Design a protein around this ligand. Structure first.
Ligand SMILES: CC(=O)N[C@@H]1[C@@H](O)[C@H](O[C@@H]2O[C@H](CO)[C@@H](O)[C@H](O)[C@H]2NC(C)=O)[C@@H](CO)O[C@H]1O
Ligand SMILES: [Ca+2]
Ligand SMILES: [Ca+2]
Ligand SMILES: [Ca+2]
Ligand SMILES: [Cl-]
Ligand SMILES: [Zn+2]
Ligand SMILES: [Zn+2]
Lengths: 403, 403
């Protein structure tokens, strides 16, 4: 394959999601949906009476469902959250202002999302493709928590006053907004709950938001394939525009990212409605893009495989990353995987390489790494692989307490 | 040791919890606390201003924290849940009436509990002894979800009209109340989220909960130790009184329960206050009990070790259970454990034996087992060990879809 494309649809489930999923199915591809369950409650200010139907269709069709928070952080765009808040925020256009405030309350929005999903569809955990408690993406934010060494934030994603185009707008990645700093803490809280978060390389979006039918201007299939060709192995998250979409410290050339392009788009760009004629114009664009991308040598995959699943029989090189049972591991030695030698908290063949900060078992810690343990923070003083006996509060030689 | 005692304290964290924890600490034992976080919000109708202090002390002292639901099901005891609901339910005393109603919303109370704990103590996940998302117990209910074969319900735990100690009360386990049936569905939902749930063998409590001044009728230490002696290997959950505390179909003689006694009591019984002089009378009893139990040969442990952790170097017999990374496994053949060969979804030496009903990999399914998969229910028509390509929707010889 020329590469692997990961289609990711955000902000569903809404009525428009149904035909999107039908087009993916017709095209013989699987995609990943980052959902906001407030649409199931009928308060997300979209056409959403079929939100549940869409959720079931996504899951029955085998697409991956990931977590984008209950309300897309709209509780931080209004004085008091209620049924009108989604519309109130769309009126003021303040989505990107003070988007993140109390990072603990904002991380809790991702759990509330699951409660709601599991309320409207009580059988949802019977679907293996339900990844709501494993994969997430932060609203507005091209931020990543993939492995211990593959992490980076969207340092100008959200603002404390001005929107990115308005005059007087500045962004300093070195000294980011309070909203950004809070979103960074959200990433960390989710990573310690076991989440991976992923941003994107290319945003399939209206090329003109300044007209009354912006959905119509969604990039056509042929040019969009050129954008994808250009993004392949070119570290797109750093060069992407606009500025609030950048991941400034993205680890360019990082092995996990080689020959991959993550596409971001939105279900709501594919309806005939307030943004224009998205269903009539853009459904054919999606069908065509899939057709031509395959013809050009690409394959399509889902974000549960972005970090490849450990596979019996596969040969791994030292330092390669896999996902096993939702946990990221890194190979200690080159070897060939077999049935009884799976990665784990006690394997000598692998170390845990989750993007978490809490002290964790079987992690290769380096001098200078900071870990949390029983409410305190510690520096690692001597490089070592952690084990159950070697807790930071009982190993004052391995760890230096801060703070 | 003569046997292992698991001290378990329910309905905290409250002011009374602090001195309980200090007695445990002075006595040199650890215990397991099944907490209701509504006390942290100040709406639980107990003396509870030191709730967060108690939580922190429990965790800093090495005690295990388990999940007892956010509000002890008080939402099902009132018309509309709010800040006064705890006092309203204490007025009617109707706690054990209609205790469980909508299983989905009742199970969601366990998740809300964790959101609240993780709000008041944002560092809580950095404590290994925080088991809030692994270990639970259902309010009012001596119910068990331990392994695939070790499960049983409290079939008279709660009722649809009369309290168990009122004249005219009847329970038929063969035809359980609606409340009990709903509570069974809550056990099943928690089990599918990866929880184990445990009941108890002996309760340090008044005769029944209808008894006036409950804290003033706890048994003395010496007789209580005698009750623990009698509970050892005697299937107490079947013989225990009163009737609402019984686990009727408890698997007498099940290996995991051998030589163990789980004690239940409540932190609020150790307070000088409305229920009696519980601090003055019962703190000394607890202290004395701990001393004489050790002197008699018992040891004390915590519920995170109730199922024993998998241990490298240990020789296992076919059929033996271990806990590994939060999951229960059962040995396939007698063998000696090696570092790189741990239980997992692909191990040949172990099968997954979580007490869950959703179809799961590497599980030894037996005829008559019913699994959930992608929203549908299937009967296991032929015994086998599940694996990735043997999903119910594609194996109509192994599985039989239900109407
Ligand atoms: C393990 C279990 O669920 N035990 C039950 C007790 O919690 C329960 O007592 C009542 O608990 C409520 C929640 O903490 C209190 O608000 C209430 O005041 C308390 N009642 C009394 C008289 O103290 C009892 C009573 O129904 O039943 C046990 O099964
Ligand atoms: Ca969880
Ligand atoms: Ca994970
Ligand atoms: Ca578990
Ligand atoms: Cl066993
Ligand atoms: Zn979004
Ligand atoms: Zn209780």
């Amino acid at each position: 394959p020329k590469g692997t494309i990961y289609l990711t649809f955000s902000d569903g489930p809404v009525n428009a999601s149904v035909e999107v999923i039908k087009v993916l199915n017709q095209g013989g591809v699987k995609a990943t949906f980052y959902f906001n369950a407030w649409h199931l409650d009928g308060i997300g200010d979209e056409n959403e009476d079929r939100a549940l139907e869409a959720l079931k269709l996504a899951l029955d069709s085998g697409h991956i469902v990931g977590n984008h928070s209950y309300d897309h952080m709209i509780h931080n765009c209004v004085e008091e959250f209620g049924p009108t808040s989604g519309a109130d925020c769309n009126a003021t256009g303040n989505h990107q202002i003070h988007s993140y405030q109390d990072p603990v309350r904002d991380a809790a929005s991702f759990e509330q999302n699951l409660i709601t999903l599991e309320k409207y569809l009580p059988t949802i955990r019977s679907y293996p493709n339900y990844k709501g408690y494993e994969l997430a993406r932060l609203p507005y934010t091209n931020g990543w928590r993939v492995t211990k060494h593959f992490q980076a934030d969207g340092l100008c994603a959200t603002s404390d006053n001005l929107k990115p185009w308005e005059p007087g707008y500045v962004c300093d990645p070195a000294n980011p907004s309070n909203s950004v700093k809070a979103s960074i803490q959200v990433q960390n809280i989710l990573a310690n709950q076991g989440y991976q978060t992923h941003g994107w390389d290319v945003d399939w979006a209206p090329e003109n938001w300044g007209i009354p039918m912006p959905a119509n201007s969604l990039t056509e299939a042929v040019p969009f394939l050129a954008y994808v060709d250009k993004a392949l192995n070119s570290c797109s998250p750093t060069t992407i525009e606009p500025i609030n979409s950048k991941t400034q410290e993205f680890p360019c050339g990082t092995p996990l990212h080689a020959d991959k392009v993550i596409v971001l788009t939105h279900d709501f760009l594919f309806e005939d409605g307030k943004r224009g004629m998205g269903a009539t114009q853009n459904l054919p664009k999606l069908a065509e893009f899939i057709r031509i991308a395959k013809e050009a040598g690409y394959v399509f995959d889902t974000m549960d495989n972005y970090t490849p699943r450990w596979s019996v029989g596969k040969t791994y090189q030292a330092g390669e990353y896999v996902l096993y049972q939702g946990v990221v591991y890194k190979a200690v030695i080159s070897h060939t995987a077999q049935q009884d030698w799976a990665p784990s908290s006690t394997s000598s063949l692998w170390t845990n390489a989750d993007p978490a900060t809490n002290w964790t078992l079987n992690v290769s810690y380096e001098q200078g790494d900071i870990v949390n343990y029983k409410g305190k923070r510690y520096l690692v003083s001597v490089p070592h692989v952690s084990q159950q006996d070697w807790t930071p509060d009982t190993q004052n030689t391995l760890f230096t307490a801060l703070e």
